Design a protein around this ligand. Structure first.
Ligand code: CLA
Ligand code: CLA
Ligand code: CLA
Ligand code: CLA
Ligand code: CLA
Ligand code: CLA
Ligand code: CLA
Ligand code: CLA
Ligand code: CLA
Ligand SMILES: CCCCCCCCCCCCCCCC(=O)OC[C@H](COP(=O)(O)OC[C@@H](O)CO)OC(=O)CCCCCCCCCCCCCCC
Lengths: 118, 61, 54, 80, 165, 738, 39, 144
């Protein structure tokens, strides 16, 4: 048997996990990728701006932080692509994971560009 | 081969007690391949003091 | 199973991360590869020597 | 799979069999020793190579030998 | 003299080192009473320091550029320049006492192997037999060369050997 | 029914079994055949569980063993008092505490070791001691060497009584098992009689002897001129001259007019300004309160009358919905397993020793202690080490319980069972939090090292660049400092100077000043948290997986201490809980070494020093230097190692010798830790051949040490080397700059 | 008393007594003949 | 003796659920199922950690690796005098009986077992590694 905990077997936890975009089972992998990218690039743009090496120079801290965030999103999309090329030889397929990685690239760059346009 | 209680000398080369002296317990008279039971006053690395040997692995010396 | 390492199917049938390290470590031990003869041994050693010189 | 071999110095004391944590060895009829028993290793695909059998064998030298070979999921003792 | 080394009684850094150690001891001495036990202990220390430097200058030791005694380990050069007391007489004294210890241990081992409990006489020492062999061990070089010349010092090839050989 | 139960004459007193080594073990009583036997004889000598299955006989053995330990400690105390009376400068020190260094060991004048007898003052020559006995003796009111001599004789007599008690309660009248199992009665008697009557009688001695003698010593009168303590008991008029409360006698005690005892039962706080120690009146009130508290606490458990609680009933009453049967079965576990008790008692005893270290540095309880910087460093460091060792021991004996005494058919859906049943979750979360702590704590140091090396100091984690202030600790500090005004109205000052406030100095030296916490203090505290969490990870993993794991499902049958289960399944070296204690020992060394380094550098930088402003021993470099590893390497180790490395030709030369010797022993351990016994056995084979050739092969067969003994020898020489190294460094440093 | 002498004949007690004798002998020699380096 | 069959509808021991149970190996590769019949209700020790109550009658547990079933078999056989048998189950549903594969436990001789992996010589009668160089793989001299 498996151990029972509120954390693994709560109904609010089950509804929250079923509502997060990695679980909906019937939405497109491109759409999952662009939503996950719009979340993660928008959160990742922050600490590069606030703590990076150009953080104390005006008008260029936000540019350098968003540019480094876009570079890290590109590295993450390359990581997703090589993970799919290794793992699969609708989300859990070769074509579906390539769609998901391209969607993550597009959504992450859009999230960084919207975190700048601020 | 040798009788009970007599001293032999071991010539099995991978034995712990090779080139040393033990004491015969018994020799089995069946078609067993290693009938000569020899006891040794010192133990091997496994803590065993007794081993079976063949007729051409013991010399009554 | 997997392709790496090509010189040892005993390592290529390893389902663990031990396969990557032992493929890295047994790569230049040509006397213990699959299907290795003696002429092939000396010839691959000769090519490796040229590689060292380059 | 690990290479497990039984040699004719076996005295059929069954110590290796009752020491293996994997049920790899078993005792077969034989005529070479007074016990009329010999060990045998018919299931070496499940052998992990712990060498409890070798620790349990009384003969000098060993009558059971474990040669560590190519690893599988069963020989690495993985539960995952 | 030997190797460009001056004798210590001729060396100047030796006298400088003696004067420096006396200076440190008297700087420590000058902050006490006269009949007090620290002053008595420091005057005994200064007496031993002067006696030690006088004895090393008397023994004919060779000092270097640092004023420190150097030893000569060559039998012919030592016996030629009067330095056998520093390496040569100590090495024969050591070999006498080290062969003493080894020969008494070997005789105790041979004496206790001839019983029904050699390990028991190895764990619980037979004190009368050990003192008997310890007093009889004074003729160990003569006894050792006699056991050498009889062929009983050495075991034959009934020793334990590996599979290789 | 609680009563005395004893068997008469169980074991005859005879020298027979002294003459039979290994009599206690059926295996080892056969005699020696290989050398392994000897080691086994000493390793299993005190493992009484492996001797007999009878809990009664085991309990008796541990009881008399404890008596033996107490006798040894009494011999030790007797020795310290005797050397303090006969071979010391204690009286001279009493006459001038600020300019005479405490010394109570002298060496004989042979082979030049006489130089170790240095100029400690008082017309004496010896080794300066750092145990703090002189300050303890002055605080107790001792003034002459005669009293110390009488204390030495008393402690020796008590040691003879303890060894007689051991022999008596093992061989003549040995308690029964149901006597040992009266834990309710044992708690009542130990909480009342031991702690309660202990602190009551000590408060008695303080109020009646310590306070007047130390009041006169602080007044300045010559110790020989101070009235002897028995005169203080006899003539209450002198007690009324110093503290007029004593004129009224014990009438305010019984009439409950306790406010009139405010002369000697105070609540001043802080330190005695002319003496640098806590007020003995505060200490007397403290011990009276402690006494009354413990005597109240010792009447809780039911014994031979209806009143009183029941341990099993309190345990079985606390059950909730989340934990199921709750604390059911724990009483049965803690009244039948010595190892479980030893685990609990070791954990709390170690933790208590660490609390002793911190509270004794922060609130110096003895006079002329805070300015004896060597004594302070020594005491803190010592008790911290003792603490850490006892914690590791707690983990060890917890695991030993888990393997030998754990029995789930009396322990079925229980707190212990659920812990065992979600151990994977526990260890995985502890694993993650250890990696998190490691990354961010150590990563700040590596980050700072990189930025400092790259010429970019403005990007570091420091007080002038990116600040990481310990806001919570600063707030607690400020609250503690402001407490006497609002939340503790009867307190004249704060409990410790380190909270904030002024500065107490004695003889030109700083006794204690306010300690400030900044980015460097933040970083070292999170380093401490990291190392402690890792040590807990190793030990707790050891105890939770002692019985089984996915790798070794039947690990319990292999015992507590075993090398492995062979090279199969990938390799199972160090799977035993014993091996987890072995690794926890190394990690404990790591943690406590960084702790004592923190203490040493912080005190020398921000606290200690001379008063002219205060000139600190290392000028206050901590706040800017303790953010990089290079800073610790250069400003702490390298800089402060000068004294130890140039100690030759003086009285501190022994610290240089033990510095080198300790480095050597530490390195010598690496051969055992890094190697394995197969190689050594084969080497011994060749050597055995050489001995056979000359007829000198021993009958007891030379064997390489076991795998586990190699690990044990390794970790023991490792600890001895490292700890002794830091010992020599610390003592030479603080004695030369103190 | 026989068993007490057997216990005194055991190995660590004899090692202790013998090393005490040897160390004391060297100590006595270094006291009465202070600091010897040669001869 | 005939080879028995696995009943998947066998009641399991009373157990609150550990974190040391099955993983994705049970879903992808294989898992093993142990079966015994008890005489009375009695608490045993689970090999994955914890305590469990066996029922009175047929019992059924499932484990990840083989040594877990051997450890529970050794416990139930030396402590409770029971006779368990454990099988091998695949995600296809293929069921492979073993232990005792002959029906008689392997610690005693049974007529009909064929001896496997038996070198009919001593260990000192093996060849040198020069004699087995340049085969199709790494070989030990004891393989021939
Ligand atoms: C003439 C030069 C020469 C040649 C042609 C060979 C050839 C061989 N050696 Mg030999 N040997 C040599 C010199 C040579 N060796 C030297 C100089 C040493 C001492 C170091 C050895 C010690 C040695 C051992 C112990 C063994 C061999 C083995 C072998 C065989 C397999 C090599 C292999 O597969 O490993 C692949 C190589 C690696 C996996 C290298 C790993 C990297 C090493 C550990 C260094 C890592 C440091 C790293 C680079 C530093 C980075 C710093 C960072 C900050 C940048 C092959 C026959 C093996 C063998 O015969 O097996 C039966 C074997 O066990 N050699
Ligand atoms: C451990 C090796 C060793 C070495 C390197 C030396 C070195 C020396 N020996 Mg010494 N010697 C030794 C051991 C050694 N000795 C031993 C064990 C004995 C006792 C048998 C001697 C007995 C001895 C005597 C009597 C003399 C020397 C002398 C010398 C010096 C010059 C001879 C030479 O160069 O021969 C190289 C050394 C060896 C090959 C080792 C064997 C030594 C043989 C046995 C004796 C050699 C003596 C030599 C023939 C005398 C040369 C006279 C010289 C003026 C040319 C030279 C410093 C001579 C000297 O005093 O020079 C100032 C000298 O008169 N040695
Ligand atoms: C002095 C008279 C005396 C005599 C003749 C005996 C005789 C015996 N005792 Mg008893 N007993 C005594 C007093 C005595 N005891 C005392 C004073 C105590 C309290 C400690 C005990 C408590 C006691 C216990 C708990 C047990 C015995 C047992 C025994 C029996 C076997 C023990 C043995 O042979 O080991 C002889 C032991 C030694 C020679 C070692 C002495 C250890 C001391 C404490 C060492 C302290 C040294 C100290 C650490 C310094 C080290 C410094 C450094 C080098 C490390 C034997 C009949 C055992 C028994 O009956 O088992 C069935 C048993 O379990 N005794
Ligand atoms: C340090 C404190 C200490 C204490 C309180 C004990 C106590 C004990 N030891 Mg232990 N022992 C110790 C340290 C200690 N030991 C150390 C450091 C070692 C080396 C590892 C040993 C090695 C050892 C062995 C081999 C044996 C004991 C035994 C004993 C028990 C019997 C002692 C006895 O009867 O003599 C009574 C003591 C006196 C009468 C006074 C001591 C006088 C001697 C000669 C000094 C007793 C419980 C014996 C035992 O456990 O039996 C079951 C036993 O066989 N000890
Ligand atoms: C109120 C009475 C009383 C006092 C003061 C103590 C004190 C102690 N007991 Mg406890 N004990 C008691 C009642 C008491 N016990 C009762 C009623 C039981 C049965 C339920 C026990 C069962 C018990 C066990 C099983 C053990 C102890 C141990 C201890 C010692 C712990 C070591 C320590 O840190 O002390 C600090 C040290 C001192 C304060 C030294 C002074 C000690 C002297 C002897 C005064 C203690 C009073 C004593 C009980 C009077 C004995 C008189 C005797 C002649 C009849 C400590 C001396 C442990 C021990 O170490 O055994 C040796 C131990 O293993 N006790
Ligand atoms: C806990 C330990 C302790 C002890 C031993 C003492 C002891 C003492 N205090 Mg106290 N004191 C204490 C704690 C203690 N104090 C604390 C905690 C406080 C703070 C509240 C005080 C505050 C205090 C004050 C203010 C005073 C004392 C005083 C005294 C003395 C007389 C008290 C008295 O009349 O007792 C009552 C009498 C007895 C208990 C009699 C003892 C029983 C006898 C000896 C029995 C003999 C029987 C036997 C059969 C006969 C002998 C036969 C033989 C010759 C053959 C006495 C020395 C007084 C004093 O003198 O100050 C200097 C005093 O004024 N104390
Ligand atoms: C420098 C010496 C050293 C270091 C760095 C480590 C490191 C570690 N030990 Mg080890 N340990 C050591 C000595 C050391 N140990 C020794 C001598 C022993 C023998 C007794 C052990 C025995 C031991 C045990 C028993 C355990 C550990 C564990 C750990 C890990 C703790 C988890 C953690 O903090 O992650 C954080 C990582 C670090 C603190 C390492 C530094 C990382 C740097 C600062 C940043 C890395 C980024 C990097 C620069 C990027 C590289 C890019 C490049 C490749 C291109 C950690 C990896 C424990 C474990 O794994 O459980 C969690 C554990 O239980 N060790
Ligand atoms: C290991 C701890 C650690 C930490 C905290 C830092 C921190 C920093 N480094 Mg340093 N560094 C480190 C180790 C560390 N470093 C090591 C070991 C090295 C040597 C390799 C360096 C070498 C180095 C260089 C050369 C530089 C830095 C710089 C910096 C700064 C900028 C970094 C940045 O912009 O990243 C971007 C930020 C992120 C990637 C954030 C990711 C982590 C997020 C915040 C975790 C959040 C988890 C969240 C709480 C979970 C919520 C879950 C929930 C929502 C469900 C920053 C202060 C730069 C600087 O100049 O600083 C002034 C810089 O140039 N570092
Ligand atoms: C292994 C190398 C080694 C060697 C060759 C020496 C040699 C010496 N040491 Mg040194 N020492 C060593 C290691 C060594 N020691 C170590 C490891 C330490 C630290 C523990 C010391 C610490 C030390 C001190 C503190 C002192 C010495 C002293 C001495 C001198 C002693 C002479 C003597 O004892 O009277 C002669 C002894 C005898 C005659 C006894 C032998 C009895 C037999 C029967 C004689 C037979 C002759 C025929 C001698 C030169 C002393 C000295 O003054 O040096 C100059 C001295 O005070 N040593
Ligand atoms: C917060 C923890 C609350 C813990 C708490 O409130 O537990 C309370 C909860 C109460 O249980 P019951 O009321 O049923 O208990 C009844 C009896 O068993 C106890 O009297 O205990 C549990 O359910 C166990 C769950 C442990 C969960 C472990 C979480 C561990 C987190 C570790 C983080 C520590 C950080 C700070 C350390 C200084």
């Amino acid at each position: 048997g498996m151990l029972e905990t509120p954390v693994t077997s709560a109904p609010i936890v089950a509804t929250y996990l079923s509502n997060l975009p990695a679980y909906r089972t019937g939405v497109a992998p491109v759409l999952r990728g662009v939503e996950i990218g719009l979340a993660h690039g928008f959160l990742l743009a922050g600490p590069f701006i606030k703590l990076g090496p150009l953080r104390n120079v005006p008008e260029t801290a936000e540019i350098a932080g968003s540019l480094s965030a876009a570079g890290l999103v590109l590295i993450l999309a390359l990581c997703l692509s090589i993970y799919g090329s290794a793992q699969f030889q609708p989300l859990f397929s070769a074509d579906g994971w390539s769609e998901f990685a391209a969607g993550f690239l597009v959504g992450g760059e859009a999230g960084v560009a919207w975190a700048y346009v601020c | 081969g040798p009788k009970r209680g007599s001293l032999v000398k071991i010539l099995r080369p991978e034995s712990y007690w090779f080139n040393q002296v033990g004491k015969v317990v018994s020799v089995d008279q069946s078609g067993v391949r290693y009938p000569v039971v020899v006891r040794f006053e010192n133990q091997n690395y496994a803590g065993v003091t007794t081993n079976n040997y063949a007729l051409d692995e013991v010399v009554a010396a | 199973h997997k392709l790496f390492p090509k010189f040892s199917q005993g390592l290529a049938q390893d389902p663990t991360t031990r396969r990557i390290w032992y493929g890295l470590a047994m790569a230049h031990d040509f006397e213990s590869h699959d299907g290795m003869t003696e002429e092939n041994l000396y010839q691959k050693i000769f090519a490796s020597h040229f590689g060292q010189l380059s | 799979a690990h290479i497990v071999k039984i040699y004719d110095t076996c005295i059929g004391c069954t110590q290796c069999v009752r020491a293996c944590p994997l049920d790899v060895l078993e005792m077969v009829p034989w005529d070479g020793c007074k016990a009329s028993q010999m060990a045998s290793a018919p299931r070496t695909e499940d052998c992990v190579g712990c060498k409890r059998c070798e620790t349990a064998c009384p003969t000098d030298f060993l009558s059971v030998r474990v040669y560590l070979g190519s690893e599988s999921t069963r020989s690495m003792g993985l539960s995952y | 003299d030997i190797a460009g080394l001056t004798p210590c009684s001729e060396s100047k850094a030796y006298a400088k080192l003696e004067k420096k150690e006396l200076k440190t001891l008297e700087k420590r001495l000058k902050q006490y009473e006269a009949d007090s036990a620290p002053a008595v202990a420091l005057k005994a220390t200064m007496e031993r320091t002067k006696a030690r430097f006088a004895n090393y200058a008397k023994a004919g030791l060779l000092c270097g550029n640092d004023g420190l005694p150097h030893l000569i380990a060559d039998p012919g050069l030592a016996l030629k320049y009067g330095h056998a007391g520093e390496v040569f007489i100590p090495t024969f004294g050591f070999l006498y006492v080290a062969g003493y210890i080894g020969y008494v241990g070997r005789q105790y081992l041979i004496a206790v192997k001839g019983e029904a409990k050699p390990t028991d006489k190895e764990i619980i020492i037979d004190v009368p037999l050990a003192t008997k062999l310890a007093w009889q061990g004074a003729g160990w070089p003569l006894a050792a060369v006699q056991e050498l010349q009889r062929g009983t010092l050495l075991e034959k090839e009934e020793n334990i050997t590996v599979s290789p050989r | 029914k609680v009563k005395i139960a004893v068997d008469r004459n169980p074991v005859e007193t005879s020298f027979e079994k002294w003459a039979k080594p290994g009599h206690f073990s059926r295996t080892l009583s056969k005699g020696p055949n290989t050398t392994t036997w000897i080691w086994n004889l000493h390793a299993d000598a005190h493992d009484f569980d492996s001797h007999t299955s009878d809990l009664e006989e085991i309990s008796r053995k541990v009881f008399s063993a404890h008596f033996g330990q107490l006798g040894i400690i009494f011999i030790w105390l007797s020795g310290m008092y005797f050397h303090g009376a006969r071979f010391s400068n204690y009286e001279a020190w009493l006459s001038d505490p600020t300019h005479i260094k405490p010394s109570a060991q002298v060496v004989w004048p042979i082979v030049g070791q006489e130089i170790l007898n240095g100029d400690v003052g008082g017309g004496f020559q010896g080794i300066q001691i750092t145990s703090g006995f002189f300050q303890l003796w002055r605080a107790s009111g001792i003034t002459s060497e005669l009293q110390l001599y009488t204390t030495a004789i008393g402690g020796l007599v008590m040691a003879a009584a303890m060894f007689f008690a051991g022999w008596f309660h093992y061989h003549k009248a040995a308690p029964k098992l149901e006597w040992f199992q009266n834990v309710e009665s044992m708690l009542n008697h130990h909480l009342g009689g031991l702690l309660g009557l202990g602190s009551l009688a000590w408060a008695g001695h303080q109020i009646h002897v310590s306070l007047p003698v130390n009041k006169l010593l602080d007044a300045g009168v010559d110790p020989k001129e101070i009235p002897l303590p028995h005169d203080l008991l006899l003539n209450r008029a002198i007690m009324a001259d110093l503290y007029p409360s004593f004129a009224k006698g014990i009438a305010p005690f019984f009439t409950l007019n306790w406010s009139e005892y405010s002369d000697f039962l105070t609540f001043k706080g802080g330190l005695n300004p002319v003496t640098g120690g806590l007020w003995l009146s505060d200490t007397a009130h403290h011990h009276v309160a402690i006494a009354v508290l413990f005597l109240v606490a010792g009447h809780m458990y039911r014994t031979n009358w209806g009143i009183g609680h029941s341990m099993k009933e309190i345990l079985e009453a606390h059950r909730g919905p989340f934990t199921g049967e709750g604390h059911v079965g724990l009483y049965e576990i803690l009244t039948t397993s010595w190892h479980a008790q030893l685990a609990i008692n070791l954990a709390l005893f170690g933790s208590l020793s660490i609390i002793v270290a911190h509270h004794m540095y922060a609130m110096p309880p003895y006079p002329y202690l805070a300015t004896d910087y060597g004594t302070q460093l020594s005491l803190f460091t010592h008790h911290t080490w003792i603490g850490g060792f006892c914690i590791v021991g707690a983990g060890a004996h917890a695991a030993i319980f888990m393997v030998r005494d754990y029995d789930p058919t009396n322990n079925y859906n229980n707190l212990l069972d659920r812990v065992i049943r979600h151990r994977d979750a526990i260890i995985s979360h502890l694993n993650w939090v250890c990696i998190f702590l490691g990354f961010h704590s150590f990563g700040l140091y590596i980050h700072n090292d990189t930025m400092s090396a790259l010429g970019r100091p403005q990007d570091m984690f420091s007080d002038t660049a990116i600040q990481l202030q310990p806001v919570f600790a600063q707030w607690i500090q400020n609250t503690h400092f402001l407490a006497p005004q609002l939340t503790a109205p009867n307190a004249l000052a704060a409990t410790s100077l380190t909270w904030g406030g002024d500065l107490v100095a004695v003889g030109g030296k700083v006794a204690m000043m306010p300690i400030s916490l900044g980015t460097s203090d933040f970083m070292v505290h999170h380093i401490h948290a990291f190392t402690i969490h890792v040590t807990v990870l190793i030990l707790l993993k050891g105890v939770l997986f002692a019985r089984s794991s996915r790798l070794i499902p039947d690990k319990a049958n292999l015992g507590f201490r075993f090398p492995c289960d062979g090279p199969g399944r990938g390799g199972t070296c160090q799977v035993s809980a014993w091996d987890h204690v072995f690794l926890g020992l190394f990690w404990m060394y790591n943690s406590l070494s960084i702790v004592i380094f923190h203490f040493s550098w912080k005190m020398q930088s921000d606290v200690w020093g001379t008063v002219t402003g205060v000139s600190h021993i290392t000028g206050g470099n901590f706040a800017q230097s303790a953010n990089t590893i290079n800073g610790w390497l250069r400003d702490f180790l390298w800089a402060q190692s000068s004294q130890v490395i140039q100690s030759y030709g003086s009285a501190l030369s022994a610290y240089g010798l033990i510095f080198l010797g300790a480095h050597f022993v530490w390195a010598f351990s690496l051969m055992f830790l890094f190697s394995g016994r197969g190689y050594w056995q084969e080497l011994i084979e060749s050597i055995v051949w050489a001995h056979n050739k000359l007829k000198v092969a021993p009958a007891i067969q030379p064997r390489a040490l076991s795998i586990t003994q190699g690990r044990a020898v390794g970790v023991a020489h490792y600890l001895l080397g490292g700890i002794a190294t830091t010992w020599s460094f610390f003592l030479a440093r603080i004695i030369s700059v103190g | 008393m026989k068993d007490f002498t057997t216990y005194l004949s055991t190995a660590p007690v004899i090692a202790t007594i013998w090393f005490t004798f040897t160390a004391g002998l060297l100590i006595e020699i270094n006291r009465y003949f202070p600091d010897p380096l040669v001869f | 003796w005939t080879v028995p069959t696995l009943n998947p509808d066998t009641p399991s021991p009373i157990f609150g659920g550990s974190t040391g149970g099955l993983l994705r190996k049970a879903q992808t590769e294989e898992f093993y199922v142990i079966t015994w019949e008890a005489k009375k209700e009695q608490i045993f020790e689970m090999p994955t950690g914890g305590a469990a109550i066996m029922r009175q009658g047929p019992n059924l547990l499932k484990f990840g690796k083989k040594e877990q079933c051997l450890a529970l078999t050794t416990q139930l056989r030396n402590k409770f005098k029971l006779t368990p048998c454990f099988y091998r189950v695949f995600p296809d549903g293929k069921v492979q009986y073993l232990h005792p594969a002959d029906g008689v436990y392997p610690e005693k001789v049974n007529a009909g077992r064929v001896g496997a992996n038996q070198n009919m010589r001593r260990i000192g009668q093996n060849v040198n590694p020069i004699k087995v160089k340049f085969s199709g793989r790494m070989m030990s001299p004891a393989e021939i």
